[PDB]
């Protein structure tokens, strides 16, 4: 019937760039990258990027339109907006001199520097990302490597000291579970660290622990997005530890 | 407490079920923690250490050969440019019914 | 002949030529003790590599995020400085 127009279907509808994604979600770039890391939105590559965007280069990041539309219904967007409004209220109270009101509003901010937990709760994200405890056990390799690495780092604004102490607590709880159930199988002293291999419910879990020394933070890594990974893996390991302790019939937390 | 594993899109899209892009040359999925080799041990076996040492040695040798060849190419280019500039200076001096 | 031509775990060591992000990932840091630098004890062990960079490279290679470089300075908004009206009209 009516003639179709060029560029109104196909890869142009299948993909969008990072700029179009942040404009669609009305998010800041740190919040967008944080939410993409938490929800598992991965970069993509079209066959012809010029069909998607005529100004696209080899460094242009592409995502799925359906992935962005799935992100559009995430409850954490409301949490981000609520926290921005609450910070404006705290700034107003501090500027007017209402110190008691500022403290009362600040105790609703749930800061990582005072709680040791992530600023935003990821409990609904954990179940969505891992439908099964087997999937949780399979991602435990990266989870344990990440948390055992960040258990030995100095404090930054991204990952505060209470958060680092919570990571140490979760690592120690997992170690106590392994000690009690006798699930540790192999260990290896390599030149870069100590490899541990355990066997939990038929799944082999191999992770790397640094030697206890001053770990060097370099400028070649994106430490803030690493911190977002730390929040996600901390939230995952808490539930994994609870399920394992309840499965062997112990009180959690110890 | 809360225990997992026990119009909003409650159905996840198949785009999310698509696996991520792997940057490996063979295109297969890279493990999060790859299994280490005995040559990476702090007190390694002699054969493993010698194998790793000769691999890194030949890699360093070929890299140094490549950078020396590139330096030779660059210095030949600069010498050719200098000779052409000298010739240009000499040319300007000489110019001055069926 | 054309049919024969058509007929004929990943590794972090060698990667594809196409980049994912601002740049192509470089080769890893050399993780090997030189024969001069071998020690006879766990106490005198020299750790090699950086585990932060190892996890970051693992994330980029597995494709959970793209390779980006650090921006140390951002371009400030261009502004013009003027004196306030009360300070202009102050008289003494």
């Amino acid at each position: 019937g009516k003639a179709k127009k060029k560029g109104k279907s196909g890869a142009a509808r299948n993909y969008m760039t990072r700029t179009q994604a942040v404009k669609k979600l009305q998010l800041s770039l740190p919040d967008f990258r944080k939410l993409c890391i938490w929800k598992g939105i991965y970069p993509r590559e079209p066959r012809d990027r010029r069909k998607v965007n005529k100004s696209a280069t080899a460094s242009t990041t592409f995502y799925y339109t359906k992935d962005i539309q799935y992100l559009l219904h995430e409850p954490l967007l409301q949490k981000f907006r609520e926290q921005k409004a609450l910070e404006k209220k705290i700034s107003r109270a501090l500027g007017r001199g209402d110190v008691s009101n500022a403290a009362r509003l600040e105790r609703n901010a749930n800061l990582p520097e005072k709680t040791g937990k992530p600023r935003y709760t990821l409990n609904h994200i954990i179940r969505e990302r891992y439908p099964t405890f087997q999937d949780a056990l399979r991602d435990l390799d990266d989870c344990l490597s990440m948390l055992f690495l960040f258990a030995n780092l100095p404090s930054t604004t991204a990952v505060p000291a209470k958060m680092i102490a919570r990571c140490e607590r979760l690592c120690h709880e997992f170690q106590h579970y392994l000690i009690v159930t006798h699930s540790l199988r192999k260990s290896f002293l390599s030149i870069k660290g100590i490899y541990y291999q355990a066997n939990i419910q038929g799944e082999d879990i191999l992770w790397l622990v640094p030697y206890k020394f001053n770990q060097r933070i370099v400028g070649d890594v994106d430490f803030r997005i690493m911190g977002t990974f730390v929040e996600f893996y901390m939230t995952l390991l808490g539930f994994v530890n609870y399920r394992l302790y309840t499965s062997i019939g112990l009180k959690y937390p110890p | 407490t809360y225990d997992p594993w026990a119009p909003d899109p409650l159905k996840k899209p198949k785009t999310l079920e698509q696996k991520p892009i792997s940057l490996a040359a063979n295109g297969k999925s890279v493990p999060a923690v790859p299994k280490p080799t005995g040559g990476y041990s702090y007190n390694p076996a002699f054969t493993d250490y010698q194998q790793r040492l000769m691999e890194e040695s030949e890699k360093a040798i070929e890299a140094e050969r490549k950078r020396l060849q590139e330096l030779e190419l660059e210095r030949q280019k600069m010498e050719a440019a200098a000779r052409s500039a000298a010739e240009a200076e000499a040319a300007e001096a000489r110019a001055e019914k069926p | 002949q054309l049919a024969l031509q058509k007929i004929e775990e990943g590794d972090d060591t060698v990667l594809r030529r196409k980049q994912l992000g601002k740049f192509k990932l470089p080769e890893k840091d050399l993780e090997l003790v030189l024969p001069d630098e071998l020690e006879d004890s766990l106490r005198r062990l020299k750790p090699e590599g950086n585990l932060l960079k190892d996890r970051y490279r693992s994330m980029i290679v597995r494709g959970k995020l793209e390779a980006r470089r650090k921006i140390p300075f951002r371009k400030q908004a261009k502004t013009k400085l003027t004196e306030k009206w009360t300070f202009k009209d102050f008289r003494i």
């Binding site: 060097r216 933070i217 370099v218 400028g219 070649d220 | 890194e56 040695s57 030949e58 360093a60 040798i61 890299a63 140094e64 050969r65 | 840091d29 050399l30 090997l32 030189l34 024969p35 001069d36 950086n50």
Partner: peptide
Amino acid sequence: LVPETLLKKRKSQEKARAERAAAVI
């Protein structure tokens, strides 16, 4: 072209780059 010297030079530049990246009213 001594391979030991080449590897030591490569490690020296690697450690140098790592340290250099980590460093009136």
